[PDB]
């Protein structure tokens, strides 16, 4: 599996608690370790999984209540990352124009999403699109 270290910004993200992210404005930003994983590739959409750099936490999508939901999830570093990632971890990275979208494989049409307001959490469903800043 190929990984890069990178960040995201809105149309910044930070680790606001032990398994939570928040979006706000400016340099303690969360660095993700992005990995390309098996799945369905087509025009400008690549399967990806998002983990934290030097933390064994990966974004995943589950049903809480009976609504798909975004959570940071603990995983064994020996087993992760792997090429065949479990669907919950699988994000369909979509690029249109100059902007990216991440769509839960497990639940299509649900995306990584942030509030317009400052200091609100990142959620699965309102800004659905994002900027990536690739880093050393």
């Amino acid at each position, epitope marked *: 599996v190929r990984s890069l270290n990178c960040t995201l910004r809105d149309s910044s993200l930070v680790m*606001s*608690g*032990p*398994y*939570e992210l928040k979006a706000l404005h400016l340099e303690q930003q969360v660095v993700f370790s992005m990995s390309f994983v098996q799945g369905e590739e087509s025009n400008d959409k690549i399967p990806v999984a998002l983990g934290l750099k*030097e*933390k*064994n*936490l990966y974004l995943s999508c589950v049903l809480k209540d009976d609504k798909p939901t975004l*959570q*940071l*999830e*603990s*995983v*064994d*570093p*020996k087993n992760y990352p792997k090429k065949k990632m479990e669907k919950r971890f699988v994000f369909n990275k979509i690029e249109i124009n100059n902007k990216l979208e991440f769509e839960s494989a497990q639940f299509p049409n649900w995306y990584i999403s942030t509030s317009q307001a400052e200091n609100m959490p990142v959620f699965l469903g309102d800004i659905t699109d994002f900027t990536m800043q690739f880093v050393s």
Partner: antibody
Amino acid sequence: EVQLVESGAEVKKPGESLKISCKGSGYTFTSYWIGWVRQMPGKGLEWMGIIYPGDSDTRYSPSFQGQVTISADKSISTAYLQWSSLKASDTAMYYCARFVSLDAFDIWGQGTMVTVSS
Amino acid sequence: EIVLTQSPATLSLSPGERATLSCRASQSVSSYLAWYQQKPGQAPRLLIYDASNRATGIPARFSGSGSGTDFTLTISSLEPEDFAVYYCQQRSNWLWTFGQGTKVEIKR
């Protein structure tokens, strides 16, 4: 079984240094946050601090910032809590516990009693 | 600053009676509220997470509910081993707090 095992009871004098330990097994120690909790005799639970063993990211409670240090050795799967100079008022039971994303402490150690007297 | 306050401090009830324990947050919070049980001589154990979800192994007589500021733990019919101390708990960002505890006591 999923487990956290703490070290044994300590009886120390004031002014002494002390380090206690909390060792996990049955799961990946590096993947889950670990908290330390204080309980004074006859009293409630008080959160002291938390550490992510993978990268030793450490956050403290404001009432315990600078009174203690929380550390971890991933090669031993062990988190620690330590004092430089104990007072009598540190006399308490200390627990370590694993904090999972569903937002609770789901597995607790058996506790370690610390008694500080001359 | 978020304080969780429990009531009552001592809840004296008969074995077999239903028990309702209250935990009130000083300000509105997500429903990610946990409840722990501490039997005398023992370590706490998790009973309820996210307000209303029983943890694995926890008998069915324990339930939780609530949202906003107002949270309850209900034990539907008390058994001898239920007589113990209970604590609620939450976390806002990098702050974790506990209620001060309610001791469930045997009324006679």
